[PDB]
Symmetry: D2
Amino acid sequence: MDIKINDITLGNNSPFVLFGGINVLESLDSTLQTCAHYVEVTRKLGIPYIFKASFDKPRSSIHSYRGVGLEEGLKIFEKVKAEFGIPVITDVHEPHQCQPVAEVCDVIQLPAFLARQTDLVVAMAKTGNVVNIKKPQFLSPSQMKNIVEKFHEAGNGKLILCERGSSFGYDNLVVDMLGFGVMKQTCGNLPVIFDVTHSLGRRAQALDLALAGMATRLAGLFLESHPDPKLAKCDGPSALPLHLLEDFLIRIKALDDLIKSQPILTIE
Amino acid sequence: MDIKINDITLGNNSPFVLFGGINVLESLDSTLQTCAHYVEVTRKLGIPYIFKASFDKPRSSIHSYRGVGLEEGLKIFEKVKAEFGIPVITDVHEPHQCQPVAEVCDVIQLPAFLARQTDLVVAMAKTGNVVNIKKPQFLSPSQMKNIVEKFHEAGNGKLILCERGSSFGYDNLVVDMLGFGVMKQTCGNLPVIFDVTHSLGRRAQALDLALAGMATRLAGLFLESHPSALPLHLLEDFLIRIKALDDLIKSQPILTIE
Amino acid sequence: MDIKINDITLGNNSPFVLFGGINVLESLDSTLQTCAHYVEVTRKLGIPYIFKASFDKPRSSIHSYRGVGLEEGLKIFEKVKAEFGIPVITDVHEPHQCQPVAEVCDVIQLPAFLARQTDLVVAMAKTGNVVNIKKPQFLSPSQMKNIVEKFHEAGNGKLILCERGSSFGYDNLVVDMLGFGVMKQTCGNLPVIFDVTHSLGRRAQALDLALAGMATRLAGLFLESHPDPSALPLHLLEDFLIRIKALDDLIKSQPILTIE
Amino acid sequence: MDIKINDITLGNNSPFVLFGGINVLESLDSTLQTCAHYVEVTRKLGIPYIFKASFDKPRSSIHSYRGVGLEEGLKIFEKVKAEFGIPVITDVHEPHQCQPVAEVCDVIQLPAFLARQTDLVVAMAKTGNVVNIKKPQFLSPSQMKNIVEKFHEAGNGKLILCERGSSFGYDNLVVDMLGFGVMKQTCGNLPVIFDVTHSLGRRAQALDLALAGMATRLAGLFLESHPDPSALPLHLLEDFLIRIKALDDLIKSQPILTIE
Ligand SMILES: [Cl-]
Ligand SMILES: [Cl-]
Ligand SMILES: [Cl-]
Ligand SMILES: [Cl-]
Ligand SMILES: [Cl-]
Ligand SMILES: [Cl-]
Ligand SMILES: [Cl-]
Ligand SMILES: [Cl-]
Ligand SMILES: [Cl-]
Ligand SMILES: [Cl-]
Ligand SMILES: [Cl-]
Ligand SMILES: [Cl-]
């Protein structure tokens, strides 16, 4: 099943869509600057693109920076849309936020941590917007159908499943490449995308992991990069250096183009 | 570090406290009847007891029973407290709930899935109530120190750490019995309790697992019962065993291996 | 199902048996000295005791110490048995070793890393000796019935199942305390014992872990001790075992409670 | 580091080599028929090829078919080499087997289950043959360096590291795609290959898993087939390999990008 996000076609047998940006909104200028680089690179290479950012980071330490908030975040997203003409994605945290965020933001994201909170799921469903569901590290690929069921019952079937790794002992994640296939098979072939950033604790391996994931035939890649850099723990420890964006994406796109040009081979 | 909950002294070198009750409040009478059974059994045996129940089930299906809700829930807890003269514990899911729930409920519980929601942690901290922190299946015993830090930063140090198992592959949980010690050593010897019910698959294994856990020298046992859950009629036979073991473990000085 | 080892009754509802000793044999004197400490303490407390040691360490690095070897190892074991009149246990690594080792050693042990080696299982089985099966970190409790079936087919039912923890991510073990019961239920209630030593992170945690395991109602406890792989400090042996026994006596004094 | 195996260049930046064959040798006839198909397909597509088979299955249940055995096994291998002029690979289980197996078989394989058995490692190293090290499901990628160090100490540096998945709870494996990079970085960029067959549960997932692995830039792919739970249907080999080769050629055409 494909989903339409404005001009973009999202689906497991379509050219991959980049859901790309930064961990959290810092300011209007930094946002436009970082977004512009993503927009120029994506236009150059011909990759469908949706700008990603959180306006709030609700797990942040008490007196540490957590974002700009809902009011100024939505203002920044409005400007990104007006300036670049692209779709955007952000995450929602309380049921009340859903309708107003859904007015501006084209895709609304269910945090992995809140993935089981029924009122949030219902509230998101009611908006009618495309929804990105982050798969929790503690949930099996087959347990995702229950979240999908819940959304369907609440009357919204435009769902994206986003992989971010699974708990592997203490203080460690592993990405089960077989999980992509299980989610395709058991959730009606909804678009599946890969959050390579949050599957990682360091950036050196980001390309190898991304390429492996995309080799499995996916609707898209979800990725964060540094902005106008805030070094000491501000951008996320696995964020890609922004200047490498082109060199990175050119390889992802070449791989994706190859996989998608070959018909699906059933092994029976 | 010991914590006072009315007359109860809760601590890792104190007689174990039973955090016992049901999954969700359904009706006043049903709650009173089941609570009465716990109260009678625990007073008979001489085990400090705190009655547990949720007033809402925020994660259950659209097509399921989701509880009596806050307003009704608090009324029931008020009645439980007045009738039996015991403390109670419930979970909270939203910052705005904390102050009203904390007016009635002696212990307020941070749900595992919300363990890292800062706004909730702050709102719970501000009540000044004793807090029960549910340890998520995906967090290491070391990572728990970070939640404890948040609470301290928010001005509340009356914290309980509650073990409920850790993720072990897909759809399976294992309880790392070493994690109790790691939490004790790294989180300032705050009270550690064991949620045996949510650690389990089959109820058949509940005594064996509860005894294993309590053998590591813990402040309390957290369990649910039903007339998954322990059958309510077996509560006395079950508690006799836990108490015998707890009393034995606590009668022998901590043997430090070095 | 109980197993008799000379005058010892080993079983999941009998007083726990201590399988205790050292990692590797080094010399006669040192072996007698350490066994003497164990024997003194276990005789005093009234705990059935079986002395454990390897004669070989086949995974050790090339330039590391490996033990005294088979021939010298058996002589030491003969001497240990002669002096103290207790049963002994050692591990075997090759089919040919099984018969001569079994003539001397009361319990022979299948190493975790070789637990699936059919020819080794067959040769151990044929001795008719009591066998201790070390559960591998990568095997589930229900996969152990496959090892048990193998011993049965080869004609030996005097089997002990020995828990030592399970792979938990990279570089960590966790002991699933529920696994004891699953092995009890699906492997015909064979004696289950707990290797607390090879389960462990740092020794400091040995008492807490041993007590947790024994709380589940087990046939025995398996530990190694150090000079004073985090073995127990030898000078703490008595204080340690007083607590294990006290707990084991309490658990065993109460009839099994079926939860239904 | 590259390894020469006859005319084949094996390395993490060379065209991928296929280590392909069957679980176990049953007869010469059946071996030749299956190998013939591999040879034809790999020749047509231009993929370097090494035929794989075990002559023995040391972990099978007692009365399951265990393979033809060493003597008959080496004869079959000799005929494979004579008929097709290709290199071959097989696994060894005892030190005494190593020199005679190494005479015939170009690559000798250390089983996952025996990975830490020092005597076998040493006996394998002394042959001077190319060695495939199977990574155990319970060893971390950084623990592999210790096996490599042993082989280096015992005189052999022609080593291949073979991924086959890691323990993930009970009776489940996961392949950590990051492990390939970690092995390359910490073990001197030795050739790393991927056993998709043993990593798997249902054969339906074989292509996706294999492509994912090879996307990480590897020296080779390791698989079993069968005319027709995990083995690839022999008739799909061409279609399968067309896709692996297309992905491999692309990845290997692009300069390594280090994220800095
Ligand atoms: Cl995110
Ligand atoms: Cl956050
Ligand atoms: Cl998560
Ligand atoms: Cl990482
Ligand atoms: Cl609860
Ligand atoms: Cl719930
Ligand atoms: Cl949880
Ligand atoms: Cl060893
Ligand atoms: Cl093991
Ligand atoms: Cl193999
Ligand atoms: Cl085998
Ligand atoms: Cl293995």
